[PDB]
Amino acid sequence: LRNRVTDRYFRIQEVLKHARHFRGRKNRCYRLAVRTVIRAFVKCTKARYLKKKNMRTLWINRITAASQEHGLKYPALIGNLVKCQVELNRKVLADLAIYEPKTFKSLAALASRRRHEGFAAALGDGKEPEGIFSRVVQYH
Amino acid sequence: GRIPGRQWIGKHRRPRFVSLRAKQNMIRRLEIEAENHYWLSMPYMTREQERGHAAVRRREAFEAIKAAATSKFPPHRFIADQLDHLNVTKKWS
Amino acid sequence: TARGTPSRFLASVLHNGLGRYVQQLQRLSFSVSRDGASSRGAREFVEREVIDFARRNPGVVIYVNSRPCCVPRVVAEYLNGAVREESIHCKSVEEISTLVQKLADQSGLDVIRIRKPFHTDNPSIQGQWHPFTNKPTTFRGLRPREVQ
Amino acid sequence: NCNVELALTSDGRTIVCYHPSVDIPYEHTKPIPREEGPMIEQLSKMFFTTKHRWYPHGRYHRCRKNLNPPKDR
Amino acid sequence: GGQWRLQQGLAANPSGYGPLTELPDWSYADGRPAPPMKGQLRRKAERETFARRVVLLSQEMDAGLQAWQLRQQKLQEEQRKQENA
Amino acid sequence: SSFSRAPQQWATFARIWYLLDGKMQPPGKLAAMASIRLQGLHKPVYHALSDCGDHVVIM
Amino acid sequence: GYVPKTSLSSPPWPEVVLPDPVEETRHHAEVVKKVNEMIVTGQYGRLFAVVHFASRQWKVTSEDLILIGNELDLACGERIRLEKVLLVGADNFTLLGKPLLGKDLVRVEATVIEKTESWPRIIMRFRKRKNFKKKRIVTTPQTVLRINSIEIAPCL
Amino acid sequence: KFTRSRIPEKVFQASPEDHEKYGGDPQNPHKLHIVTRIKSTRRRPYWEKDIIKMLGLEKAHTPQVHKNIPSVNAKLKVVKHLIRIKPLKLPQGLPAEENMSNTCLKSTGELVVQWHLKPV
Numbered sequence: 001l002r003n004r005v006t007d008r009y010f011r012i013q014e015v016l017k018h019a020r021h022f023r024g025r026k027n028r029c030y031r032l033a034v035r036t037v038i039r040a041f042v043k044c045t046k047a048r049y050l051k052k053k054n055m056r057t058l059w060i061n062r063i064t065a066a067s068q069e070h071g072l073k074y075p076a077l078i079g080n081l082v083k084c085q086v087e088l089n090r091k092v093l094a095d096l097a098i099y100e101p102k103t104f105k106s107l108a109a110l111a112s113r114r115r116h117e118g119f120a121a122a123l124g125d126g127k128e129p130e131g132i133f134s135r136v137v138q139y140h
Numbered sequence: 141g142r143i144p145g146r147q148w149i150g151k152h153r154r155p156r157f158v159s160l161r162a163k164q165n166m167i168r169r170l171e172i173e174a175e176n177h178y179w180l181s182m183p184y185m186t187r188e189q190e191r192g193h194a195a196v197r198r199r200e201a202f203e204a205i206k207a208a209a210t211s212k213f214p215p216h217r218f219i220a221d222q223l224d225h226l227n228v229t230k231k232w233s
Numbered sequence: 234t235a236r237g238t239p240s241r242f243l244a245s246v247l248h249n250g251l252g253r254y255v256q257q258l259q260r261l262s263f264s265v266s267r268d269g270a271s272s273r274g275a276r277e278f279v280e281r282e283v284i285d286f287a288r289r290n291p292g293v294v295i296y297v298n299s300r301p302c303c304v305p306r307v308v309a310e311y312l313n314g315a316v317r318e319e320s321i322h323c324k325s326v327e328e329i330s331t332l333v334q335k336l337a338d339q340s341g342l343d344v345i346r347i348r349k350p351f352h353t354d355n356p357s358i359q360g361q362w363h364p365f366t367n368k369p370t371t372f373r374g375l376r377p378r379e380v381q
Numbered sequence: 382n383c384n385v386e387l388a389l390t391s392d393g394r395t396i397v398c399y400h401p402s403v404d405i406p407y408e409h410t411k412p413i414p415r416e417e418g419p420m421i422e423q424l425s426k427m428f429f430t431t432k433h434r435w436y437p438h439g440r441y442h443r444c445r446k447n448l449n450p451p452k453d454r
Numbered sequence: 455g456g457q458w459r460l461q462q463g464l465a466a467n468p469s470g471y472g473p474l475t476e477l478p479d480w481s482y483a484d485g486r487p488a489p490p491m492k493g494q495l496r497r498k499a500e501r502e503t504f505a506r507r508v509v510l511l512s513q514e515m516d517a518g519l520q521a522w523q524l525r526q527q528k529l530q531e532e533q534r535k536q537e538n539a
Numbered sequence: 540s541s542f543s544r545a546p547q548q549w550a551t552f553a554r555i556w557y558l559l560d561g562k563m564q565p566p567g568k569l570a571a572m573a574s575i576r577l578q579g580l581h582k583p584v585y586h587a588l589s590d591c592g593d594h595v596v597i598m
Numbered sequence: 599g600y601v602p603k604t605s606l607s608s609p610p611w612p613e614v615v616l617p618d619p620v621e622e623t624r625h626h627a628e629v630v631k632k633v634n635e636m637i638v639t640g641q642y643g644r645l646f647a648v649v650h651f652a653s654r655q656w657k658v659t660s661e662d663l664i665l666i667g668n669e670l671d672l673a674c675g676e677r678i679r680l681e682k683v684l685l686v687g688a689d690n691f692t693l694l695g696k697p698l699l700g701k702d703l704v705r706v707e708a709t710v711i712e713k714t715e716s717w718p719r720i721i722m723r724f725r726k727r728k729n730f731k732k733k734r735i736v737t738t739p740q741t742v743l744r745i746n747s748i749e750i751a752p753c754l
Numbered sequence: 755k756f757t758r759s760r761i762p763e764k765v766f767q768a769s770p771e772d773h774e775k776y777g778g779d780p781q782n783p784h785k786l787h788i789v790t791r792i793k794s795t796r797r798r799p800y801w802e803k804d805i806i807k808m809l810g811l812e813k814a815h816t817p818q819v820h821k822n823i824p825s826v827n828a829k830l831k832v833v834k835h836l837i838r839i840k841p842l843k844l845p846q847g848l849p850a851e852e853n854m855s856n857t858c859l860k861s862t863g864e865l866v867v868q869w870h871l872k873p874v
Contacts, residue, residue: 021236021445038724038731039724040234041720041724042723042724044720045720045722061580061585062585065583066583069581070383078455079455082459084696085696087684087697088648089654091654092655092656092657092685094583096657097362098357098361098362098584099356099361100357100646100657100687101367101583102385102402102689102692103359103398103400103685105385105400106387106692108383109383109398110396113387116614117616132619132622133389133396137696137697137873138463139473139870139871139872139873139874140866140871140872140874169835172792173834173835176834176837176838176839178768178776178778179776180766180830180831181767182822183822183827184515184785185515185519185823185824187824188522189518189522190824190825192518193518193521194514197514227273228270231269240451242451242452242453243663243665244663245663245711249712250746251661251746254675254709335713338712338713339712339713339714340711340712344714345717346717347717348453349453350665350666351656351663352663353657353659353663354454354661354662356659357540358645358646358687358688358689359689360402362582362583363547363550364553364555364582365550369382370405370406370409373408373409374409374410378558386632388626388629388630390630390754394873395693395694395696395699395703395754396696397629397633397691397693398692398693398694399633399691400691400692401690463861463862465861468697473698473871474682474697477682479650479680480670480681482676482677483679483707489671498855501857501859502854502855505865505867508786508848508849508865509848509854511785511819511820512785512786512848515785515821
């Protein structure tokens with residue numbers, strides 16, 4: 001047995017240290033543990049995409065809850081903070097909804113105001129003055 | 141309520157219907173398509189005027205390709221690599 | 234994975250940039266072998282950069298020894314008493330100098346998962362939300378179907 | 382609810398919102414007034430939950446619970 | 455909401471060009487400007503190469519037109535001169 | 540703001556009772572309002588595991 | 599033109615009439631004068647600010663921490679003036695910009711505390727029945743900032 | 755058999771209703787196209803994958819400037835359902851060497867050679 005592998009304990013414990021919190025003989029026996037630990041690492045690397053996706057639908061749920069509380073909806077709040085060139089993202093808005101609700105009150109009121117201006121400026125088509133908050137900022 | 145073979149292959153298939161989503165999506169791709177049809181209609185040079193207007197730039201670009209193919213040859217070999225490797229027995233006295 | 238690994242919230246050590254910044258690394262212990270091949274690059278660092286490094290940032294005290302029991306090494310000790318021990322086995326001078334600045338650049342806190350990318354301790358100014366922030370009051374505090 | 386005073390500064394590159402905190406009026410306020418199975422029914426109906434939340438659980442499950450977890454904020 | 459952005463001449467994606475990508479994110483408290491961001495260096499260089507190509511193409515187009523006018527005028531000079539003697 | 544830790548948390552998470560008259564109404568608009576309020580989807584504190592749902596009394 | 603009041607004549611959302619621009623600019627002048635006269639006298643408490651740093655916006659209160667997934671090429675402890683402030687709020691007013699508040703109005707300053715690696719992040723690919731199995735470990739660079747000042751100028 | 759498709763000539767002869775709607779002038783036609791790819795070439799025949807590589811449009815939603823000559827017109831016409839063609843407008847002059855660093859492409863198709871970002 002001119003040279004046989006002596007360094008094998010350490011392969012097995014590379015793999016078995018990521019399996020100690022498992023259930024059943026997958027926490028202790030190597031063939032079973034190999035399968036499940038590879039399966040664990042694969043789930044980790046697809047769960048990065050699912051973590052970003054989960055975070056954004058949680059933000060949409062919270063902002064919807066706060067703006068449904070202030071009369072608006074989610075589309076009215078977002079698609080009217082767009083039209084004022086207010087570029088907050090969802091994370092900021094959901095944090096504002098929880099921790100600073102007079103500022104969310106201000107945002108929901110501004111969004112509804114700009115909504116009614118963006119219809120009443122669009123209800124009287126033809127030449128008029130434009131609305132107050134329908135005035136854009138050009139960058140040149 | 142079963143579809144006989146596989147759902148979307150065969151003689152008998154599960155029916156698929158057109159949402160207003162699908163009609164709107166297809167109609168707006170048609171609008172983009174139509175503007176493309178418009179702008180491909182006013183060509184600047186006529187087909188005789190372009191004959192040769194950039195032969196020089198194509199020939200120089202191909203000479204770059206051609207001389208980029210032939211300038212291929214093994215790398216230079218130096219001494220300092222060899223003796224740089226004598227350094228792997230180096231110490232402090 | 235992350236379910237397997239410990240996890241900690243984000244922190245400083247002791248309000249580390251509020252009043253003044255404190256260089257959080259105390260010690261380093263290079264242990265470079267005289268006649269040893271694995272410490273080759275480490276020895277070059279000691280002749281080349283470690284005086285410049287020790288003069289660049291004086292908050293650290295630096296010990297250069299000979300003959301470790303296993304592997305040439307840096308022993309970084311921080312002001313929360315943590316020890317990070319890195320092996321500089323078979324490394325060139327570039328990699329060692331980046332690792333030593335890596336050690337200086339950090340705080341003693343572990344390199345386990347940080348649960349949040351942010352840490353506020355006074356999070357809320359206009360008052361945190363409770364179900365009675367925006368709800369309107371009644372008259373005489375009555376509830377629905379309350380007679381008088 | 383919303384009672385805020387919204388404005389632009391004159392140039393129109395900011396939006397200033399004025400929102401004071403409105404206190405609750407005094408009139409809108411009241412004066413202060415001065416076995417094991419049947420166990421799980423009584424607790425469930427006290428706390429409005431299903432029975433399953435109060436059934437105990439194994440040593441193995443109680444042995445994965447972290448008892449020095451990180452706090453924050 | 456990026457159809458409204460396209461109508462107004464803003465970009466559909468506000469993280470494209472705008473103040474929120476092409477201003478610098480930070481500066482020293484003393485007032486010294488930052489090193490330029492490596493994304494912004496990359497994007498300015500993309501913009502460089504694009505404008506270089508537009509200039510090259512425009513020169514090739516109009517040089518082709520002028521060369522065709524020269525071919526026609528020299529042909530007509532030869533037409534008028536071969537109708538002599 | 541400026542509550543103590545336990546009362547600020549107690550104010551935030553503790554549950555509310557909502558009456559909801561059901562006369563002449565369809566059972567699905569009642570169900571849609573009541574389902575949103577039973578899950579906790581009317582709170583900006585909403586998390587799936589938070590167990591933040593409220594009480595609904597449909598008469 | 600006149601329509602009797604039936605079910606579907608006037609749509610169910612409420613009718614609000616936009617005020618004329620003259621008294622509305624009078625109103626805006628009154629509001630801006632109130633808010634600026636608060637700012638000149640310090641009638642506010644502590645401030646928060648939504649700030650568009652590295653690629654994503656943070657809600658930043660003074661005296662706190664922000665972890666940023668890149669190496670910022672700044673020596674440790676070094677002060678920074680976080681430009682691109684895009685909301686600044688207090689207990690009794692806010693100021694949001696379109697999209698950015700001016701640099702002449704809000705100063706937000708931070709420091710760089712620490713410049714770490716992250717934890718090792720495992721990237722495993724696996725395709726089955728195909729002997730396809732790859733593993734990578736990525737340690738990302740991270741820098742932690744501490745935000746010191748949110749100071750507001752009364753230039754409205 | 756599905757094959758290549760000759761598009762009839764009459765499709766690319768615009769009417770005056772076009773010239774009112776779009777902003778073109780049939781007299782004095784424009785310099786260059788800005789072409790965007792908006793539709794992947796997967797699930798498309800190999801000749802359209804070839805022409806997308808030849809036009810340099812590989813990355814979706816990336817503008818590419820192409821000459822308004824007939825030859826580029828023919829390559830574009832085969833792949834006109836994958837792309838978007840806008841005229842390259844020049845409001846000012848084309849960028850001289852001085853400002854050719856400090857340029858911009860505007861979404862309306864036009865290239866403005868002075869890149870500011872300040873309030874006006």
